[PDB]
From a paper:
Cryo-EM analysis revealed that S17R4 formed a major polymorph, termed S17R4C, representing 72% of usable particles, and a minor polymorph, termed S17R4N, representing 28% of usable particles. In addition, a disconnected density belonging to residues N108-A115 forms an interface with Q30-Q38. Furthermore, S17R4N is notable because of the highly “kinked” conformation of residues N8-Y16, which is reminiscent of low-complexity, aromatic-rich, kinked segments (LARKS) associated with reversible amyloids. For S17R4N, significant elevation changes occur in the N-terminal residues S4-N9 and again in N26-Y32, leading to many inter-layer interactions.
It has been shown that the yeast [PSI+] prion state is caused by the formation of amyloid fibrils of the translation termination factor Sup35. Interestingly, Sup35 can form distinct fibril structures, or polymorphs, that underlie distinct [PSI+] prion strains.
Residue numbers in the entry:
A (entry chain E), B (entry chain C), C (entry chain A), D (entry chain B), E (entry chain D): 4 to 38, 108 to 115
The structure:
């Protein structure tokens, strides 16, 4: 929840990578481009 | 939760890499570009 | 949780690398560009 | 948790490398650029 | 947890390298640039 006051640029460029608890299987691709953009996964 | 007051640039550029607890399998690609951007995984 | 008061630039550029507890398998790529950006993994 | 008061630049540029406890396998690439950026892994 | 009071520049530029306990295998690249940046691993 956003319950704060006075904060400028709060977590402005924060990035959180993979979080897994338990017995989980993840295969996939997540990409965000905010603007020539090459984001490429070629397994 | 955001329950704070007076904080400027709180965790502005924070990055958290992989967090796994248990028996988890992750294969994947996560990329964010905020702006020529080459982000490339060529396994 | 963010329960603090008066902190400027709290963890502004903090980076946390891989954290694994248990029996976990991770193969992947995580990249964030905040701005010519070349971030490249060519295994 | 952030439960502190009066701290300026708390852990402003802190970096935590790999932490593994148990039987874990990690292969991957984590890079953050906050600004010509060349971050390259060419195994 | 951050449960402190009065600390300025607490661990401002602290760096923690690899920590492994048990039977773990890590191959990878972690780089953070906060600003021409060349960070290069060419095994």
């Amino acid at each position: 929840s956003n319950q704060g006051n006075n904060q400028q640029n709060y977590q402005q460029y924060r990035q959180n990578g993979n979080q897994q608890q338990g017995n989980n299987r993840y295969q996939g691709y997540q990409a965000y481009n905010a603007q020539n953009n090459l984001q490429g996964y070629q397994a």
